[PDB]
Structure 1
Amino acid sequence: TIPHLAIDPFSLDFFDDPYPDQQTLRDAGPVVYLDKWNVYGVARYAEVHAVLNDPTTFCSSRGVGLSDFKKEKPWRPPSLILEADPPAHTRPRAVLSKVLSPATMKTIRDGFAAAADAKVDELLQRGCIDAIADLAEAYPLSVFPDAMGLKQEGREHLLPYAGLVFNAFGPPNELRQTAIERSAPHQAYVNEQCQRPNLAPGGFGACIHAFTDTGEITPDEAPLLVRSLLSAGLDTTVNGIGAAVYCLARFPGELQRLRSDPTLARNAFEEAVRFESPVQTFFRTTTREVELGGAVIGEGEKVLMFLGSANRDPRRWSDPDLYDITRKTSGHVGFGSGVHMCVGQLVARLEGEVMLSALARKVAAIDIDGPVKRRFNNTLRGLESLPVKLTPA
């Protein structure tokens, strides 16, 4: 009933060009079995969306990577939110909700926007730049660690620590095993910065600590919740902004539309999240026997959701393979869906909007001007290097 496939969705060849294999996965059936990792797979929008929206049946507390926490030790203490199920999930979620809230966005926006304009201005002085190191990485690094309230010393650990986290969701391939081997100093830095004394007042970090007297979280939960933001908060936005620039770079027609109406900046970002889906994949674990798309999955099985595939499913999207900054993106699963839907999406969108606004107002063209180099990671899709020539408007 369930087709078995030998595709390794965590292989360098798959990362290098996932799209044919992803159609192969959708078209094989609503539910496949991946013999490489002994794992159920769902690659169509409908089943990915269903799975995300039944947290009772498809739980996150047994881990959202390949590893099943009921079978193996987690490589670090479990996240209090990503790797928890309702009701444990609920209050720490509420806290990060209020911390990364509309009101908070109102306090950081001018600063984020200024940073974004200043960067684009700086890059136009150079002309030929690396849209990854000098933009996708540099810009979030200029705003997010400050927004967190991190001290300056040690920030080089942040992107290493993130690549470790996302690699560690993957199978025990060499990417994962090499990440964990190198992890010790990045863990030490991050863990130390999660303690209240090390976070500057007014920041996301000290804000999380300040929420520890309401009955929602206790003081011993706050460091791990800060850890959550230093795990998820940065590298995701680097690959999100990287994606958007790359799309603009490959669809000049859409850059020209964006320039003509910079208010499209925020949706231009949302479409780049759908189109590239920087967060490619996550697992759930079945807490019971379940019928899904007319196939039956037993208790305790890992189910792999192909978010990027879901976002290019021609069953859901018209011309999924086109970058369209005026598309109605509502319902894309690049930020997830349901009770775990990205609690940090207002920061990502803010960062993404203000950067694409800056480009929209200041840049006339973005032409790839050198070898594009992909960066391989078990969960993240994105580029190592994107050399572009920026033409001033």
Structure 2
Amino acid sequence: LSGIDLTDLDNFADGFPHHLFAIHRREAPVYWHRPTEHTPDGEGFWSVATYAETLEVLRDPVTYSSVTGGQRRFGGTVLQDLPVAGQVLNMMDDPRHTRIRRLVSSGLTPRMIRRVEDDLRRRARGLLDGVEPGAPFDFVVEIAAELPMQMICILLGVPETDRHWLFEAVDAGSRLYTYALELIAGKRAEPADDMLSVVANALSDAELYLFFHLLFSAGAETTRNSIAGGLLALAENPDQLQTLRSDFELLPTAIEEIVRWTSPSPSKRRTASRAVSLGGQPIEAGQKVVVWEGSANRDPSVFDRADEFDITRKPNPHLGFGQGVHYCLGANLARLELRVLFEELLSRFGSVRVVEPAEWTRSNRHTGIRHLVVELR
């Protein structure tokens, strides 16, 4: 570990570096990672690679705060300190966290979920009906990116007309900002039956924009990555692809294994609020703690054959949707996207070939695939 820099994004340019996290779990489940020239804030942090310790952190939100601790002015849930801490739901603590979490969740009505689902089935069919069998195309740009973008546009009440223009936005920061502000003002003047309207008509003007941005570039991006990643895992494990396409009652379990395997959000930060021990190491109030769900999800202490993709895997207590009070509000929506996409795809196609090497997102906050060129037959 003394020669390994988890903050050097060159180590994440080619996918989540599971080899380095096997070293981390063996050598030091919990350890103090000294800052390098790549480390945000120039500051060291406790790094946690094992499942037990990751879960222990997630399950104690008083000790390990999503806001700040000690004398640190602001923290948040990514490695760099951000003043958005306290101002967006994922970066709030009780009591306001609970109030906002429930407000957002009250937007996920049965009818909204049907509205999402009906659109998703229509779209996934149209997209898969338009694939020329055998012809190479970029699965990420043509399919994986589209479905979740439409899902969150529907959740947030983005007019169908604006959706592709809005996507180019994720002058880009500017377009996004000035568009969302108008969309938000519209829902206040004229309430509509969507999540943005629920929330806007209940957060400060500024916080409502940060909420919009978050769903829009975390909810869409993570789900897109699960889909692209799942297709890649299935191309690389073709006997499992055949087993799965023979028996769609295997999909619930296959989907949980896709999320475990891909871990689209593989890292999470907190800030200690008090002296505490974790993994036998003394943490002081104010110090940063980074947990790596991407590593925890391959911990051989918890998962048998952890480095193998197994669509029949049970049990599967993965941490790819988080755990505890901040658990993914979108977990059933991401599963829904995955289920429909793979039902429609695997129905038509039993052969999936990746014809160029996957290009990965250069990041340790996301594990994502920017381009995936495939042939489906």
Q: Secondary structure at the match of 1:339?
A: coil
Residues 111 and 14 of structure 1, relative CA distance in 2, 3 Å threshold = closer
Q: Does 1:59 align with 2:65?
A: yes
Note the residue ranges of structure 2 that are not aligned, 5 or more in a row.
68-74
- Give 2:5's aligned residue: 7
Contact 1:369 1:389 in 2 (8 A): yes
Contact 2:187 2:196 in 1 (8 A): no
Contact 2:116 2:154 in 1 (8 A): no
Contact 2:135 2:375 in 1 (8 A): yes
CA–CA separation in structure 2 for the residues paired with 1:329 and 1:239 = 23
- Greater alpha carbon shift after TM alignment, 143-152 vs 3-12: 3-12
Q: Secondary structure at the match of 2:259?
A: helix
CA–CA separation in structure 2 for the residues paired with 1:34 and 1:182 = 35
Deviations 1:268-317 (A, max 9, x none): 22211110101111100000111111111001011011010000111111
Match of 1:104 among 112, 119, 122: 112
Deviations 1:61-84 (A, max 9, x none): 131112335xxxx2x575431110
Q: Does 1:193 align with 2:183?
A: yes
Deviation at 1:261, TM superposition (A): 1.1
CA–CA separation in structure 2 for the residues paired with 1:383 and 1:103 = 32
Amino acid at match of 2:294: G
- Give 2:72's aligned residue: none
- Give 1:174's aligned residue: none
Note the residue ranges of structure 1 that are not aligned, 5 or more in a row.
162-180
Q: Secondary structure at the match of 2:46?
A: strand
Residues 150 and 381 of structure 1, relative CA distance in 2, 3 Å threshold = same
Match of 2:89 among 39, 60, 81: 81
Residues 196 and 301 of structure 1, relative CA distance in 2, 3 Å threshold = farther
CA–CA separation in structure 2 for the residues paired with 1:262 and 1:124 = 24
Contact 1:45 1:313 in 2 (8 A): yes
Output aligned runs, 1:350-365, within 5 Å: 350-365=336-351
CA–CA separation in structure 1 for the residues paired with 2:207 and 2:354 = 45
CA–CA separation in structure 2 for the residues paired with 1:119 and 1:84 = 39
Residues 100 and 231 of structure 1, relative CA distance in 2, 3 Å threshold = farther
Q: How many correspondences in the alignment?
A: 360
Q: Secondary structure at the match of 2:106?
A: helix
CA–CA separation in structure 1 for the residues paired with 2:271 and 2:374 = 42
CA–CA separation in structure 2 for the residues paired with 1:329 and 1:114 = 33
- Give 2:156's aligned residue: 148
Residues 362 and 329 of structure 1, relative CA distance in 2, 3 Å threshold = farther
Amino acid at match of 1:49: L
CA–CA separation in structure 1 for the residues paired with 2:358 and 2:140 = 10
Deviation at 1:379, TM superposition (A): 0.8
Amino acid at match of 1:11: L
- Greater alpha carbon shift after TM alignment, 141-150 vs 266-275: 141-150
Contact 2:12 2:362 in 1 (8 A): no
Amino acid at match of 2:200: H
CA–CA separation in structure 2 for the residues paired with 1:349 and 1:39 = 33
- Give 1:166's aligned residue: none
TM-score, length basis structure 1: 0.83
Contact 1:56 1:287 in 2 (8 A): yes
CA–CA separation in structure 1 for the residues paired with 2:191 and 2:13 = 38
Q: Secondary structure at the match of 2:269?
A: strand
Q: Secondary structure at the match of 2:128?
A: helix
- Give 2:251's aligned residue: 265
Output aligned runs, 1:108-119, within 5 Å: 108-119=116-127
Deviations 1:159-214 (A, max 9, x none): 764xxxxxxxxxxxxxxxxxxx974444444444344439983333224335x1xx
Matched residues, percent identical?
Answer: 31
- Greater alpha carbon shift after TM alignment, 17-26 vs 186-195: 186-195
Amino acid at match of 2:107: V
CA–CA separation in structure 1 for the residues paired with 2:94 and 2:288 = 19
TM-score, length basis structure 2: 0.86
- Give 1:312's aligned residue: 298
CA–CA separation in structure 1 for the residues paired with 2:185 and 2:209 = 6
Contact 2:152 2:215 in 1 (8 A): no
Q: Does 1:43 align with 2:33?
A: no
- Give 1:290's aligned residue: 276
Residues 282 and 253 of structure 1, relative CA distance in 2, 3 Å threshold = same
- Give 1:135's aligned residue: 143
CA–CA separation in structure 2 for the residues paired with 1:273 and 1:225 = 24
